[PDB]
Amino acid sequence: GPKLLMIIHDRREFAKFEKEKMNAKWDTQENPIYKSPINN
């Protein structure tokens, strides 16, 4: 039915994203204004 195919599609879309996001590149090793909870 319409709901069955949608579910399948949605779960694939989620799985694709979970995998792709691991390809992200960090834009800095650390934020200059980051304060540890004990310092802020």
Binding site: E20, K21, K25, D27, T28, I33, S36, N40
Partner: protein, 217 residues
Amino acid sequence: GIDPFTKFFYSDQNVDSRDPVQLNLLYVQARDDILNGSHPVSFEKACEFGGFQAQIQFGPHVEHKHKPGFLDLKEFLPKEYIKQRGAEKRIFQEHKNCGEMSEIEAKVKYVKLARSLRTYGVSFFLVKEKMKGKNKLVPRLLGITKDSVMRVDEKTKEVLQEWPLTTVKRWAASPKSFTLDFGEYQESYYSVQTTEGEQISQLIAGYIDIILKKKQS
């Protein structure tokens, strides 16, 4: 020869009734941002703004003239609310609430209302995040401010969550996602699907830099 003191008065650090030209610029900027969605607002607030807008463009409410059908709604609301039930009736009730206030008073109050929202001055991106308890992506508004990052409900515009920029350890983007690492403030990363990850990263860096240069001076 005339009396300045017969007029509506209000002044705070953002806006001032005694400077008409500056006020109009502030009004135009705020109204445009709301009408075009750059400043996302709830349905209720949209109609409040609309009501001030009507007072500004038409003058005091005339009940037998200003009735459903009179307005070009798309001129007065964010597109999201044009087709919503009773929009116009709500706008006109707010218009009526304005009574005989002047154009300048209405503009001051419009700008004040805009500045009163937590969403004021925030750059929002429409993204998708994981739905609670479901393997499914759903829409959400991700906002970047001068000192924070916030998650906002795309329908109601409720601020769901806010993290100070000082709690952000690092961030990353790929051509299809964006991710925030809050280091010691919480266990898990926050990742969303979006093709605008690069823009988001730059705003965050840009704003952090403005803050890092305040410390210096």
